[PDB]
Design a protein around this ligand. Structure first.
Ligand SMILES: [Cl-]
Ligand code: NA
Length: 548
């Protein structure tokens, strides 16, 4: 009883809104800046064609073929490896804990954009240290934008073990954003009709304005050269490779179960290969273009301040809140452009959060529809999920919560855990289920036989990349650091590893549970649990599909 997407363009708009946003405008520039700039692009493209796009198309095709969500699809494909879907759910849950927190910051910035002069312009406020000097007079000192970010918005603490006191303004902003998300999920309100145009054209318009500004700012050539020219010796450490791979996985929202759910509503006879390739190219181009503006702004800041490009802003989640607000003040009438930019960022983040939360709730209600999907029960479950997520995200709202966010940025919904899922999604498909059988299914669905690119990416390239990155990250281990200076304690790293393992351990525990449930000799149990249970039976009669 899976609902169709009705209009073809509706699915394209929904996925485009889902898989673009803070991952392209916020996470990508900060990860590129943290990893030296140009050297980050070489793995990024390697994980872009070898994996990422093949994995995204694999998830979409699995959703369209099984006509099931993020959990039942693996039940139909390979019952033994069903826990992968569960793992995906856990991952998305962790994302909903922290991915919305960024919006709160943006909301705060929006509330700071309704005054005559932007607060991040001069060193004369009450939160400015004596070492605050205007960048025009900088010819050690700290930029007013950085001080506003890390002393007014955040009020950063000396460490994660110093939570301080909860910030009521950021807590109220997060509560308002969560209320907006809850109302959107409950009432079903979403971009419909002409609004979708403003939902689609506006985010790509304002960025273009930034592309006009950053390019024309003096000293942007140095920033562009830093962003494009790679450092060879920077590729010898696994950090850049794993960051690029996880950024590729994060931007495409794969290994979360949302893409499979979105592809489930697609019609069985629908050429989703071309659409998936076009959307992936659009997402990659958006990230690449936004990087140009970000690094041109950073180069201008480096030229005006006289410090090196690698030491102009925060090498962390707050890079987008130090660079773009700086470029806003350069444009005439900075208040209007700041309001527009933060509205665009809030819209992108809200669309991504809507898609992810709705997918998670759909997966949860589909897992056990009994006593959960009865009308008001679904509303109560949505309210409970939103309240639990807000209470969990309140830990990153305190003065010393930024460090916590970094952990959720590094281990939760990112890092080796994604490499844990992307491998197991491929190995089951490529070797257990069979690459040729899935190719026959795709030929039956889209109408033409695909090339060997997807088969060779599922069979070899993606598993090899995932296992190599995991092994090299373990062998050459470097503890997580915040802004290249702060060193997390042992317990913080243990908490981050526990957050990663909460999703990584779903796959092996479900295997043991399935083996214990089945009765008989071990070989018979494994053979029974490795047999797909009619993957296309849902659409066998709906579209006259060929049985598996
Ligand atoms: Cl990206
Ligand atoms: Na979006």
């Amino acid at each position: 009883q899976r609902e169709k997407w009705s209009s073809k363009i509706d699915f394209v708009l929904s996925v485009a809104g889902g898989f673009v946003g803070l991952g392209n405008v916020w996470r990508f520039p900060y990860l590129c800046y943290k990893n030296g700039g140009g050297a980050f692009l070489i793995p990024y493209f390697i994980f872009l064609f070898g994996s990422g796009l093949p994995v995204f198309f694999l998830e979409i095709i699995i959703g369209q073929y099984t006509s099931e969500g993020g959990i039942t699809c693996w039940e139909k494909i390979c019952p033994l490896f069903s826990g992968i879907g569960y793992a995906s759910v856990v991952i998305v849950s962790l994302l909903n804990v922290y991915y919305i927190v960024i919006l709160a910051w943006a909301t705060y910035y929006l509330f700071q954009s309704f005054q005559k002069e932007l607060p991040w312009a001069h060193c004369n406020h009450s939160w400015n240290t004596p070492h605050c000097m205007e960048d025009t007079m900088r010819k050690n000192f700290t930029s007013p934008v950085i001080e506003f970010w890390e002393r007014n918005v955040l009020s950063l603490s000396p460490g994660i073990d110093h939570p301080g006191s909860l910030k009521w303004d950021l807590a109220l902003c997060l509560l308002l954003v969560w209320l907006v998300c809850f109302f959107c999920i409950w009432k079903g309100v979403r971009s419909t009709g002409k609004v979708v145009y403003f939902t689609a054209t506006f985010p790509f318009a304002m960025l273009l304005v930034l592309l006009v500004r950053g390019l024309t700012l003096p000293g942007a050539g140095a920033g562009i050269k830093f962003y494009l020219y790679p450092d060879i010796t920077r590729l010898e450490d696994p950090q850049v490779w794993i960051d690029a791979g996880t950024q590729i996985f994060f931007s495409y929202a794969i290994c979360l179960g949302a893409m499979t759910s979105l592809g489930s509503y697609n019609k069985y006879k629908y050429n989703s290969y071309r659409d998936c390739m076009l959307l992936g190219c659009l997402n990659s181009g958006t990230s690449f273009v936004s990087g140009f503006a970000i690094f041109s702004i950073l180069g201008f800041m480096a030229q005006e301040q006289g410090v090196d490009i690698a030491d102009v802003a925060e090498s962390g989640p707050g890079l987008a809140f130090i660079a773009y607000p700086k470029a806003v003040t350069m444009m005439p009438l900075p208040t209007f452009w700041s309001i527009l930019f933060f509205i665009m960022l809030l819209l992108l983040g809200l669309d991504s959060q809507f898609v992810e939360v709705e997918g998670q709730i759909t997966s949860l209600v589909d897992l056990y529809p009994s006593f959960l999907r009865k009308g008001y029960r679904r509303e109560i479950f949505i309210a409970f999920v939103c309240s639990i997520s807000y209470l969990l995200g309140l830990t990153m709202v305190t003065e010393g919560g930024m460090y916590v966010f970094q952990l959720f940025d590094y281990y939760a919904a990112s890092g080796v855990c994604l490499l844990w899922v992307a491998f197991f999604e491929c190995f089951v498909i490529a070797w257990i289920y069979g690459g040729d059988n899935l190719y026959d299914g795709i030929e039956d669905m889209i109408g033409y036989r695909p090339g060997p690119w997807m088969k060779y990416s599922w069979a070899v390239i993606t598993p090899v990349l995932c296992v190599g990155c995991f092994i090299f990250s373990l062998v050459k281990y470097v503890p997580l650091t915040y802004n290249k200076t702060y060193v997390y304690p042992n317990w913080a790293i243990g908490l981050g590893w526990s957050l990663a393992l909460s999703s990584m351990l779903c796959v092996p525990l479900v295997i043991v549970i399935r083996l214990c449930q089945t009765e008989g000799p071990f070989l018979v149990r494994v053979k029974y649990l490795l047999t797909p249970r009619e993957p296309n039976r849902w659409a066998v009669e709906r579209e006259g599909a060929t049985p598996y």
